[PDB]
Design a protein around this nucleic acid. Structure first.
Length: 68
DNA sequence: GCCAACGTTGGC
DNA sequence: GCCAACGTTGGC
C-alpha cells in the first residue's frame, strides 16, 4: 500500500516492498510515487526531479521524514 | 525493449 | 557489518 508522505508536495506517496525470494529475501525497498505516478528509487533521483521545490538534505529516504 | 525484482558494492 | 544507491537480468 502507498502511504501519504506529508514531508513532500501533495500527492506524493511512499511504498515499502519486502523482498520475497533470494539471498536478500526479507529485506525491503522504499519507493516514492509522484502525483503523476512516476516511480522513484533513490534520494538523488527525487532531488533531480524536485530541485528547488524542497530541500531534501535532511530527508530520510527510508522513513520519509525530515530528520535533523 | 521494458522493468520489477534481486544482486551487488562503495562509502560509512 | 550495514545499507543507500544503482547495476543486472528473467520474464514478459
Amino acid at each position: 500500500k502507498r502511504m501519504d508522505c506529508p514531508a513532500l508536495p501533495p500527492g506524493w506517496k511512499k511504498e515499502e516492498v519486502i523482498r520475497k525470494s533470494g539471498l536478500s529475501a526479507g529485506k525491503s525497498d522504499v519507493y516514492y510515487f509522484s502525483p503523476s505516478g512516476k516511480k522513484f528509487k533513490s534520494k538523488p533521483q527525487l532531488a533531480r526531479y524536485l530541485g528547488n521545490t524542497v530541500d531534501l538534505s535532511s530527508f530520510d529516504f527510508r522513513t520519509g521524514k525530515m530528520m535533523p
